[PDB]
Amino acid sequence: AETHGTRPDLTDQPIPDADYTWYTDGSSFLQEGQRRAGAAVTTETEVIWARALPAGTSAQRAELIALTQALKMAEGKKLNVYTDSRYAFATAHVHSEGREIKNKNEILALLKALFLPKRLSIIHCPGHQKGNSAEARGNRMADQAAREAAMKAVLET
Numbered sequence: 001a002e003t004h005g006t007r008p009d010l011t012d013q014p015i016p017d018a019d020y021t022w023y024t025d026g027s028s029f030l031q032e033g034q035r036r037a038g039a040a041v042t043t044e045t046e047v048i049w050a051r052a053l054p055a056g057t058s059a060q061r062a063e064l065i066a067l068t069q070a071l072k073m074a075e076g077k078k079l080n081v082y083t084d085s086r087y088a089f090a091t092a093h094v095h096s097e098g099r100e101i102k103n104k105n106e107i108l109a110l111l112k113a114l115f116l117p118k119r120l121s122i123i124h125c126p127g128h129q130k131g132n133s134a135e136a137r138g139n140r141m142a143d144q145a146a147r148e149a150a151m152k153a154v155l156e157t
Contacts, residue, residue, distance in 0.1 A: 006095050007114040011121040018080040018119070022048065022070050023138035025084060025127075026062020027146040031154050038150030039066035041073065041081075042141040044134055048073065050145040052153030063088040064106040066146065067122070068113045075116035084127035084139055092122045 002010055014021070021043065028037040037057035040050035049069055053062055063085035070081050083089055091107055092114065100107050114120070127143065129136035 002093060004095050005093055006111055007120070009119070010093065010114065012089075012093065012123055013121060014080045014123065015078060015119055015121050017078055018121070019077045020074055021080040021082075021134075021138070022074070023082045023125075023135070023142040024063070024066035024070050024088075025139065025142035025146045026053075026057075026059055026064070026066050026088075027143060027150060028057060028059035028062050029147070029150070031151075036150050036154045037062040038146040038148070038153070039063075039069065040142050040145035040149060041066060041070040042138065042145055044137040044141060047141070047145045050149040052149045058103075060085070060087050061103050061106050062146070064091060064103060064110050066142070067092065068106070068110040071110070071113035071116050071120070074120075076118050078119040079117040080121045080123060082123050082125045082135060082138060082142075084125060084143070086124060089122060089124040 037053040041048045067088045125135045
């Protein structure tokens with residue numbers, strides 16, 4: 001049981017009985033002078049969802065959006081979901097009392113979506129990993145799909 005959290009039964013380690021294990025990533029980069037971004041939810045081997053996000057979108061906000069989308073798609077199911085983002089992890093895990101100065105909308109939407117899955121763990125794993133370990137391949141896969149989605153939309157196809 002977490003405390004000063006939002007969803008009281010949310011955990012940070014893999015639940016034995018999970019139906020789904022997904023990896024999420026936001027990615028942001030500058031191209032043609034402007035900030036571009038995308039978000040994705042994947043397993044080790046398959047892209048469940050990935051989208052380009054509007055110009056200006058920070059990495060932080062892209063990461064909230066990716067994690068929020070995974071929670072929605074897992075509604076009613078038991079989910080282990082990994083993020084490489086300490087900021088999305090904290091936002092999910094720790095309740096903040098101050099009126100949000102940044103990403104107020106994305107944070108509000110992530111917080112509502114926390115309650116969708118039947119059971120949930122949001123786990124933070126390291127990014128940029130070279131392993132064939134499940135997590136390594138999961139996180140790589142999510143990073144690649146999110147960057148790819150953002151790239152394809154900026155280039156226009």
